Design a protein around this nucleic acid. Structure first.
Lengths: 120, 123
RNA sequence: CGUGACUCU
RNA sequence: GUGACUCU
């Protein structure tokens, strides 16, 4: 299973992610979107419950800023939710998120928690 | 290289080759085999590249030549058909081991039966 | 990973 | 082999 953080690097011709310090430009985001859209991905942040999702889109907003309705609505930043619920401080908050599933449903995953499913 | 269920059964029931077993399985043999197969995932080989996966929940008491299930006919009416007969009409397949049982997969009352010979064990 | 629904049986 | 939920 290839980490999406390695994949972005190959698509955008980096050798290290610390070679992209800023948010992606619109150009880069589009290039990357063309390669990952419609791939299946599996999440890394729930032990062996590697839930798989189809990639619908890539977010325009880095994970740091991208928001979703949380009800307990107090629209939340994707990053925050991973500190809160998952005890996880993203290393790459500047990077966008993968939009997975029903677009309507605002399911957003940081790159650093996603592996592309190979398999057979 | 997924393992044929027809080989696995030879391992479980200590057959040399499957041609040993020219007769249906006794109840003893069936219980013995079910203990080892229940719960595994298998994939099918008879829909070309549509290699669907199911969870085994049981082994049939009847061979595929006699095992029946409720089939709704293209009328309204629903009648009973045998597994071997269905594999002939639907899949144009004529089973080599009709005297062997079927794997029952996912959920009892779904009456989903697959002949051994059409199934491989997935890792 | 697991369960169902699935193109089944 | 496809989609669904233990989500975000």
């Amino acid at each position: 299973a290839q980490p999406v953080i390695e994949f972005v690097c190959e698509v955008l011709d980096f050798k290290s992610i610390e070679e992209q310090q800023k948010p992606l430009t619109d150009s880069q985001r589009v290039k990357f979107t063309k390669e990952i859209k419609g791939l299946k991905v599996e999440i890394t942040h729930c032990g062996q419950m590697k839930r798989k999702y189809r990639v619908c889109n890539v977010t325009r907003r880095p994970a740091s800023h991208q928001t979703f309705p949380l009800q307990q609505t107090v629209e939340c930043t994707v990053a925050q939710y991973f500190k809160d619920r998952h005890k996880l401080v993203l290393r790459y908050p500047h990077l966008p998120c993968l939009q997975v599933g029903q677009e309507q449903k605002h399911t957003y995953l940081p790159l650093e928690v996603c592996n592309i499913v190979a398999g057979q």
